[PDB]
Design a protein. Structure first.
Lengths: 295, 300
């Protein structure tokens, strides 16, 4: 059964805040080995159901573009309060793509770096989607880089699955900026769907976050952004500097009606993603940029 | 008993002023840790949040936005903001209330329902704390059972981690997150008729009405609905109403006053303090004794 993490894992620094909880750079206490730890409130005394749901999904974390599952821990709380679940995964040494862009001059990545990273996110998502798993938490903070620029998604469907089964009393709306229109309830969409294509919208927003350092509407009160996402036209890159292929990729990700949004396999064939003649050079440049940022 | 080393206008290192008396083992999001005021030995509640070194300028701005207001028996006193350098830790410090929240009170009661005269008493105490904030031009913004605490002496106090500047709702990009919707009044939710969602003093009174339903039924309306769907329905659905017919007409009437959907037609805090459900409490002395005895029994 799920153990208290005391003396096994500790939380060191925050890497992200998402749809269901927070992600930390954590540490295996007695080795000093790093881990990505996703901390999520869960309905109290549901350890058996939690273990069942995690065990059904963990095999999907072995893929090269998914941070590998290590273990799961629970912290108990007073009667009636949600328990705290710690989902422990591998940490990729270079940290998140959001931190990389924050630490880049002009808060912008080179276009061919964005194509490379976006393809790797799409490959991780295609693995989950073919296995009928929705991620539901795609954003720069949830995409980590290793020291040689391998790209891995944090979480492999657990937060999304626990939300829908075990649940919790401490629910919140969360930050809206990576949410697709179908995830936001309105007159035409009163029940707000769970469809794999919502991850592709989030992938488009993440590409804008790599290009501009922040998602669209980042300077707006989140309640006004939540209202505007289903109403506004698809977001677009602000600068004219980008290639027509990059604008075209964003148009594919950011089709507002999910029923008309391309699949993960269709986006992997988009020229922006499919045609990367400078891939080896990009990985060398990313490795060098990670090294320079560190110092 | 006024603390003499408090400074609500500055961001200081907490050394020699406040200390934590437990480890920060549950992360730095929505976590309040037990602390101590070093000079007096008085316990304190310390909300610990991770902050970037660049966020300090925004924190100092928000500190300047804090409004001045005295201590009040129905408000857990805010003791200020501190920075514990390393991301650094921001500490927001407040008076410690040791008997749990109103939500814990109802969750630990048979049938997850409080007696009507306890609800009238607790609701009046919440309204008295709100009247103190509102007269000082402060909106609380987060009235709910979890943010109404009890002391060991059965005093009812609102949580205050610096509500006039919303210090705990902004730092570490917390200002980009929408919390739980269930206690939100319609005016704070953006929609076609309300594109610029705005809090008013009266928004707290809607939340007070939802908190009275929470005491009556154990949970706010729509509590287990997906929050995005609840956010859409609050401006559309009729005012929430108690489900049981057992309650008095005065209690139904008080809920109708709190839960007027259009804030421009919702009564003020001073008007709700005169509502018969709040104003007329012939058993208030006995209710206080019952609450104290319930707290004593729970403790052991």
């Amino acid at each position: 059964s799920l153990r208290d993490p005391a003396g096994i894992f500790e939380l060191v620094e925050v890497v992200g805040n998402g749809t269901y909880g927070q992600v930390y750079k954590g540490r295996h206490v007695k080795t000093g080995q790093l881990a990505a730890i996703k901390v999520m409130d869960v309905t109290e005394d549901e350890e058996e159901e939690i273990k069942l749901e995690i065990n059904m999904l963990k095999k999907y974390s072995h893929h090269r573009n998914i941070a590998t599952y290590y273990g799961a821990f629970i912290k108990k709380s007073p009667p009636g309060h949600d328990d705290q679940l710690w989902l422990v995964m591998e940490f990729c040494g270079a940290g998140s793509i959001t931190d990389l862009v924050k630490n880049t001059k002009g808060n912008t990545l080179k276009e061919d770096w964005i194509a490379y990273i976006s393809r790797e996110i799409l490959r991780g998502l295609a693995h989950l989607h073919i296995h009928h798993v929705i991620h539901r938490d795609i954003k720069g903070q949830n995409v980590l880089l290793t020291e040689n620029a391998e790209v891995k998604l944090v979480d492999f469907g657990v937060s999304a699955q626990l939300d829908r089964t075990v649940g919790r009393r401490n629910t919140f709306i969360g930050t809206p900026y990576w949410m697709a229109p179908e995830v936001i309830a309105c007159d035409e969409n009163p029940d707000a769907t769970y469809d794999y294509r919502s991850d592709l919208w989030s992938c488009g927003i993440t590409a804008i976050e790599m290009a501009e350092g922040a998602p669209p509407l980042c300077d707006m009160h989140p309640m006004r952004a939540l209202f505007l996402i289903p109403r506004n036209p698809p977001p677009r890159l602000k600068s004219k500097k980008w290639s027509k292929k990059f604008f075209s990729f964003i148009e594919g990700c950011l089709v507002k009606n999910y029923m008309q949004r391309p699949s993960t396999e269709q986006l992997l064939k988009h020229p922006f993603i499919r045609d990367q003649p400078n891939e080896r050079q990009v990985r060398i440049q990313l490795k060098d940029h990670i090294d320079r940022t560190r110092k």
